[PDB]
Every structure is written in structure tokens, then in C-alpha cells.
Write a protein that binds this ligand. Structure first.
Ligand SMILES: O=C1CCCC(=O)C1=C(O)c1ccc(C(F)(F)F)cc1[N+](=O)[O-]
Ligand SMILES: O=C1CCCC(=O)C1=C(O)c1ccc(C(F)(F)F)cc1[N+](=O)[O-]
Ligand SMILES: [Fe+3]
Ligand SMILES: [Fe+3]
Lengths: 367, 370
């Protein structure tokens, strides 16, 4: 009848929001051009040859507050010209040879990046890049998160110094990043490592995996982690990804129907593909499950677009998943819309979809 | 008053057509998805994990007879499961680390691929992959062309054994075939005598920052131009050799059956995934058009070129429409030429109208005016 969560607010430094995500590429132009058309993200800021960067090409896509950065290295024959100081040509080709197209950096806005970096290392974090102050404007620092992903700290005194603003329409309703999930071999150690240096508390849950969720004090920076337990997808991931790494990004949309009707039109002409849709029983069982949250027309709309729906104690959740973004069966995208919990709306409203494993199964047991 | 052309038909083996072009990628899925939407090429055949290939992912785009192959390597921890036998994981990462996104293979249909390979090596060609017979169906062989590009020989007894046909309503911007494939090289003389030395390709005569000869097969339908940098405004070909870390393919020219359609489609998509184009010639250029190709293009077709930014050139045999994209990837190296040829219809003879060498001048004296 009642579910109660706790929140010690045990953050070891002041954390604000997700700042951006840095993909590492072989050729960043094509990847950014496809992501832009397939997700509806505007070309916003560049740091390439045309801006004078002879170390790496970096292209930034935005939609709402969501910031996808796409970095690919230039030839070593053409350091000081790189806008992102923590970039190394060799670490980049190693990452792409080993893991392929994937997320390098999970970056978050924090009060002071040297403050965050100092405590993190002192509380166990493995350092990657120390605090570099860019033009006395932004501070940047990187610690190891899981595998070859880095948690990157960004703090302030069009995106970073050295980037040039790209002026211009494209917009499918995606407004912000919601959570970023990492697949690791052993949950226990990875969980005690990350929470050990961030002070992130565990967000409670209302298969082939085990999943805990680490969260900041206001529960707006959400970092779930999966463990491998039909062969487990997480295990397949660890093989094709040659280790631990970010599994999926969840992108909050202000209207999942719009974003899906846009993203679905473009699946065959450049965009992104989606998982095969649940059996029609699933949406018939919707009417007596979230019928007091979604109208019947909104339920018909989910069946047309293949959207999963889940509920927990505080709210209701709409969500759908793409197919792997690149060549390897590794990283994919989650589109979500959260309903309820509007105090502002509290993050994690509706959970993460853990219930859909069952409900989707017993949809297939029927039918 | 008169330009006369010769043709010794000195081919050392039987050569038919351009078969396909193999790009080497870091991630072939995104590159092929972008090229498909930005050029209007249909997803036709795959050889990835979903077909059982654990060495490399290969995705084929088509439009008319044009075949763009996009290959990217999988992890070595998962040779026998690879559909393309000449693929090596290390040669691929070396290529992409060194040159970035570029063309690996220029492949052409020939009568017998072991026949072509044997003579080529015997006439100087540097071998890369010997003749491998796939499922007693198609033969494949590769010799070095320029730098790390390979001339690949393909002969027959959806695309290769091991590939699975992709059913698609379908995208199509009017591109129908590949016209020519150009390589930038440090020294023209040696590269020219090397390639023609083992193919027997004759020189196609020409009616800047570069020196350009054109090597051609007997029917002048497989066209392989080569550029050289002229030193001492800095030569683009020289900049290419720096960013490309050596010689390599510079541009592919894609014949369209209607360059206006193909560009009104391709320009719509420049800002939403597709390809961008060079800044348009000054309006004087298109004014001088009316008394230059006015007996070939109507006034409406001339206004249409000004709207789409198309260059026009003429030679002894015919007239040429052409326009160039910006570099396809991160590096200022490889780009695309869209072309439509007019005249010379005996069938239409390749090289009709030349290649645009006159436009350097016409473009300039347009800017000297205005
Ligand atoms: O948000 C999360 C984090 C923990 C792992 C997880 O299961 C979550 C999902 O994004 C999610 C939700 C539902 C489904 C299902 F079962 F409907 F397919 C799948 C996922 N998932 O793993 O991407
Ligand atoms: O087709 C060729 C091969 C030889 C070299 C060459 O210049 C050709 C062109 O594709 C061409 C023609 C005209 C222009 C101009 F005038 F616009 F600059 C440029 C090129 N080009 O991109 O090489
Ligand atoms: Fe999720
Ligand atoms: Fe050309």
C-alpha cells in the first residue's frame, strides 16, 4: 500500500546538472550529421580546422539543454591548439580501436571543478585529467568512472573557450539528458567505487541483470549501473565493447509522441531504428493500469508508436529504446517522458522501467 | 579550328565497367546512413554481425549502377567468417589512423580477375591481394594504385557471396553511375607511367595549381585521372597530400540523369544531414553563359544553373554540367563531383565534354569582372 524512500543528501561536493556527453569518433562529421538528423539536434558550436584546431575536430549538437559533443582526432603531423586540454591523440585511437563508437565523457556541472576533483581522488577516485582552467572562464577535470568512460567536472567562474558559435529549426522535442547507464562486470565493486568518491546515494527501485541507481542530492544527476546475471545482453555488451562502458543514454522529451513520430519517419532515411513493438495485449492491459494517467487516445498513440509505459509510487513513465547506434551491439538510446511528481518536477519520477520486463512478458504469455 | 583525338586501345586485359568503391570507416553504419540520405542511395546489401560476419561490418549503398561500399572492422577477439577475403584488421586501422575517412578500393569489372592480376604484376604492378575465388562465383584481386588506394579486379563466372539482400517508397535523387575517380599524388610522371604501365590505359587528351592527365580504358568508360601539385596561392593538391598523409583518391564524379533534380534534392538536405557545396560563382559567370553554351542549354536551364550554382564547360565533343561538394568528412581531402554530360551520342561516349578544366579560367574572368 505504501512505498517510502530515503535521501541522506550525502554529496561530497556541490553538483548541479548534466552538462554534456562526449562521444569519441573516427570521423566526427558524419556521426554528428546523422545524430543531428536522426535525433533533431541543432549544429551549435564547432572546434575544427575552420576555427583553427589542428589536434581534433569537435562538433556540438544541442536540443533544449541536451548537449552531445562529437570528437574525432586529426593527424598528429597537424597539442597547444586543442580547445579540450584533456585530449590525447593516442588515448583516442586506443579507445576507438578497443570499443568502437561510444561515449568517452559523462560531464556534469559542479560548483567548483578543482573542488570536486580534489575530494574525489581523496575518496578513492582514479584520476584521468587534473583541473585545467580555460581562459580564466571554465574549469575542467576528469576522473575514471567505469572502464574507459570518464566522469568529467565542469565549473564556471558558446560551450567552451575555443569553440565558435554556429548560427542557423531542427527540433523533435528532446529537451534534456535524464540518465546515463554503465555496464560493468561486477556491480558491487563499481557501485562502492563510484558512490565512494561522489557520495551519491542509492535511488530505490519499486531479467539478465542487476541494477542499482546512484543519484545526486536533488536526484537530478542519475547514474545507474548494470551487472550481468537466455543470454544476458549485458554480458554480450561486455564482449563487443571489450570491457565496461556506457550502455544507454536516456533523453527526456517534452512530448514523446512528437519525438517518436519525428524519429520514426527518419529510421529508413538516415535516422535511428527501434525495437520490435510489444504484442497488442500489452496495450490492452494498459487501459486498466495507467488509465487514470493517460487518456484512451494517448494509449492508442502508444500502440501506434510502440511506447512502453511503467508506473511506480510517485509517478508514471513513458519510454522507448532504439537499436544500437553504430556497428557494434553496444550503446543505444532511451527516449522518455515522465509524468507526475511536480512539486519543478522531481527526477526519477516513475522510476526507470524495471516493471516493463514483467508486464511485457505476461503480454507475450497471453497472445 | 579542329581538335583531333587518338585511341590506341592498348588495354592489356579486357576491362568493362566501374564495379564499386570501397570506403574504409571507423564506424560504417553512421557514414553509410549519412551518405544514403545525403546522396539518395538505397541500403541494398549488408555483411555485418546480423549476417554472421565477425571480422568486419560492410554496408552497400546503391543508386542506378553506382555502388558505394562502406567497411568498418569489428574487434579481433570476435578471419574465416569475413565475406571480403582481402580484408586485414590491421591494414584497416592503419589506413584510417593515417588517412581518415577515405576510399580504400577502386574496383572495376573485368573479364577474368586472375587474368588481369597476372599481367598487371608482370607489367610492374605492386600486388596487394592475389586472386581469391568466392564460392566458385566471383573472383577478386587487388593491386596497388596510388598510395594506399587499391585497384581491385572483379570478375564473374546481391553484390558478393556472403552479403544478404536488404529489402527496402525508395530514395533516389537521379544518380545513376560513377563517372571517374581521381587520385592526388606527389609526382605525376612516375605515378602515370606506373599505372598505365600495367593497365595499358591510354591518355585521354585535354581540350590552376595542378597538372592533370587522364588514363582511360579502351572504350574510354573507366576513367582514372591523376593530379599533381604545382608549387609556387597554395595548391589544394598540396594541402590534400598533407591532411591525407600521402597520395589518395581526391574526388568521385557521379553521373546523374538530371543534375537539377539531384541538386535540388541534395541542397535541401545540406543543413539536415546531407552534403554542403562550394560558394556559388559570381553572377557574371552565368551572364557569360548565355553566349557560350546558349546553343546547348535553354535560357531556363541557364537560370536553373544560377539557382543551383552549377558550373558548365565545353570541349570539342560536347558540353558538361558539374558541381562540387565540400569535403565529406573531418579532413579537407575527399569530396564529390556531380556531373551530367551532354552530346556525343553515337549510346553516349564517356568523357563527353571533358572534365571541367576550362572552368578554372571562366570562373576567374567572372571574378575579374564583377
Ligand atoms: O533505466 C534503466 C536503468 C537500469 C536498467 C534498465 O532496465 C533501464 C531501462 O532503461 C530499461 C527499461 C525497460 C526495459 C525493457 F525491459 F522494457 F526493455 C529495458 C531497459 N534497458 O535496459 O534499456
Ligand atoms: O575531373 C577533373 C579531373 C582532372 C582535374 C580537374 O580539375 C577536374 C575536375 O573535377 C574539376 C574541374 C573544374 C574545377 C573548378 F574549375 F571548379 F575549380 C574543379 C575540379 N576539381 O574539383 O578537380
Ligand atoms: Fe534507462
Ligand atoms: Fe572531375
Amino acid at each position: 500500500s505504501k512505498f517510502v524512500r530515503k535521501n541522506p543528501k550525502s554529496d561530497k561536493f556541490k553538483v548541479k546538472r548534466f552538462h554534456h556527453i562526449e562521444f569519441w569518433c573516427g570521423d566526427a562529421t558524419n556521426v554528428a550529421r546523422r545524430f543531428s538528423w536522426g535525433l533533431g539536434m541543432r549544429f551549435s558550436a564547432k572546434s575544427d580546422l575552420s576555427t583553427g584546431n589542428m589536434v581534433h575536430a569537435s562538433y556540438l549538437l544541442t536540443s533544449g539543454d541536451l548537449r552531445f559533443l562529437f570528437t574525432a582526432p586529426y593527424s598528429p603531423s597537424l597539442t597547444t591548439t586543442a580547445s579540450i586540454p584533456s585530449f590525447d591523440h593516442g588515448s583516442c585511437r586506443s579507445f576507438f580501436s578497443s570499443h568502437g563508437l561510444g561515449v568517452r565523457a559523462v560531464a556534469i556541472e559542479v560548483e567548483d571543478a578543482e573542488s570536486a576533483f580534489s575530494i574525489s581522488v581523496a575518496n578513492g577516485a582514479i584520476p584521468s585529467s587534473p583541473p585545467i582552467v580555460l581562459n580564466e572562464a571554465v574549469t575542467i577535470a576528469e576522473v575514471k568512472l567505469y572502464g574507459d568512460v570518464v566522469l568529467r567536472y565542469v565549473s564556471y567562474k558558446e560551450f567552451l573557450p575555443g569553440f565558435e558559435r554556429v548560427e542557423d529549426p531542427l527540433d523533435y522535442g528532446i529537451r534534456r539528458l535524464d540518465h546515463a547507464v554503465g555496464n560493468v562486470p561486477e556491480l558491487g565493486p563499481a557501485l562502492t567505487y563510484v558512490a565512494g568518491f561522489t557520495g551519491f546515494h542509492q535511488f530505490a527501485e519499486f531479467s539478465g541483470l542487476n541494477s542499482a541507481v546512484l543519484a545526486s542530492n536533488d536526484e537530478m544527476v542519475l547514474l545507474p549501473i548494470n551487472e550481468p546475471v537466455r543470454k544476458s545482453q549485458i554480458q554480450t555488451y561486455l564482449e563487443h565493447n571489450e570491457g565496461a562502458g556506457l550502455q544507454h543514454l536516456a533523453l527526456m522529451s517534452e512530448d514523446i509522441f512528437r519525438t517518436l513520430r519525428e524519429m520514426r519517419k527518419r529510421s529508413s532515411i538516415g535516422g535511428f531504428d527501434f525495437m520490435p513493438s510489444p504484442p497488442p495485449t500489452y496495450y490492452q492491459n494498459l487501459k486498466k493500469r495507467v488509465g487514470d494517467v493517460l487518456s484512451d487516445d494517448q494509449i492508442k498513440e502508444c500502440e501506434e508508436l510502440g511506447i512502453l509505459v511503467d508506473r511506480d509510487d510517485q509517478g508514471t513513465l513513458l519510454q522507448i529504446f532504439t537499436k544500437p547506434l553504430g556497428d557494434r551491439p553496444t550503446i543505444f538510446i532511451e527516449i522518455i517522458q515522465r509524468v507526475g511528481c511536480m512539486m519543478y518536477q522531481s527526477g526519477g519520477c516513475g522510476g526507470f522501467g524495471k516493471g516493463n520486463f514483467s508486464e511485457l512478458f505476461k503480454s507475450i504469455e497471453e497472445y
